[PDB]
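Course exercise 7: structure representation. Students receive a sequence record and must write out the corresponding structure in token form. The form below is the worked example handed out in class, using Histone H3 methyltransferase DIM-5 (260 residues). Read each field label carefully; the graders check that inputs and outputs are placed in the correct fields and that the protein name is recorded exactly as given.

STUDENT ID: A-19
EXERCISE PROTEIN: Histone H3 methyltransferase DIM-5
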Amino acid sequence: QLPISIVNREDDAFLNPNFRFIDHSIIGKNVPVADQSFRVGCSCASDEECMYSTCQCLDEMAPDKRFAYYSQGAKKGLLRDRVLQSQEPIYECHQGCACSKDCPNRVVERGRTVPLQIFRTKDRGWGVKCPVNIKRGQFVDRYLGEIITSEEADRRRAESTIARRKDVYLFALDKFSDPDSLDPLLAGQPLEVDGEYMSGPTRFINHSCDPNMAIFARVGDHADKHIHDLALFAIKDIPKGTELTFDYVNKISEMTKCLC
Ligand SMILES: [Zn+2]
Ligand SMILES: [Zn+2]
Ligand SMILES: [Zn+2]
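STUDENT ANSWER:
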């Protein structure tokens, strides 16, 4: 919906002819998804009730207005310092809830609301910047790609040449992964998103050990915790024209392985 521009004032490089931009994640055929009958949406009377401890959607997060975004004021619609500092998962409304698309708790779901520019840095490859100012706790976009199984992810790491840097484009959806009860579905190896050939503009953001952005897990239906979203929020004020970066290290081994 929002435009994405690209500029290269440095060299003769351009995007690979096989790369494609996507709006939603593509789901691998073998990727298990919550059974129909398990899906449940809150029954809030009005979009306003959803921000309270009584909303069904927030029934999994502890207490301290319980939702992760600010109510009113200057930081309204922005991630709360509680979450920003805690890094807990974000429980949002979703397909199924009795609230409207306008629900104050559907911000990640509402999508990228900011134009972005892919640009060629002086000597570090492509990078991403924004023509408007981004405030701390502001949602920018999700990390998209093809959702695959750990088995397939492992295969891709062990069988691809390192020249492809599959490790850089594979992100595990392991927010609720834990070697325990919940079926290997949560006790076993997590699913992953592969953004090598199909992804959103965030695939072009550079890694930095002192990022201004960070990845947060956002959950729609609670039955799909194993396939949570990878949502990037600004963790610092980002004046328009400043390169966006996130810590790729914080299967590887393987890667590859295968191859050887
Ligand atoms: Zn609700
Ligand atoms: Zn809801
Ligand atoms: Zn809602």
